[PDB]
């Protein structure tokens, strides 16, 4: 089994992740929060991709209310979040880096993600077109994904 994690980094340099005892983080509205979904491996073939990312006001990723950040591999802006991806310029496919921007509140962040082996059996999420089209009633479906959350919440403050 391959194992995924969701982490936050201090800045766009992605030098080291925040650890648990540094949470809760403190951020301001419209300030970028630099996040990464990473595979803990060492296989060069594999490529990590996101499915959904969303925020809750309680620790439980299943709790309501929710704000959608990423949907079907693409930025979702309708819930008042902006996401910017950060491609790497080795093992580039072992992680997906992105920053999120929000438009005093305590927020918990989660993503769902999966791995691509470059095989016919690869998820549709392995090659996607963005922006993503909204789902129909029947279109709702679950890929085989792992849910990952941050070690702690983030406090959003008004600038």
From Swiss-Prot:
Positions of disulphide bridges: 53-111, 74-130, 116-126
Coiled coil regions, renumbered to chain: none
Record site feature (Cleavage), residues: 136-137
Expression sites by tissue: Expressed in oocytes (at protein level).
Protein modification: Proteolytically cleaved before the transmembrane segment to yield the secreted ectodomain incorporated in the zona pellucida.
Locations listed in the record: Cell membrane
Superkingdom of the organism of origin: Eukaryota
UniProt subunit comment: Can form homopolymers that assemble into long fibers (in vitro). Polymers of ZP2 and ZP3 organized into long filaments cross-linked by ZP1 homodimers. Interacts with ZP3.
Record remark on domains: The ZP domain is involved in the polymerization of the ZP proteins to form the zona pellucida.
Role played: Component of the zona pellucida, an extracellular matrix surrounding oocytes which mediates sperm binding, induction of the acrosome reaction and prevents post-fertilization polyspermy. The zona pellucida is composed of 3 to 4 glycoproteins, ZP1, ZP2, ZP3, and ZP4. ZP2 may act as a secondary sperm receptor.
Family according to the record: Belongs to the ZP domain family. ZPA subfamily.
UniProt name for this protein: Zona pellucida sperm-binding protein 2
Gene: Zp2
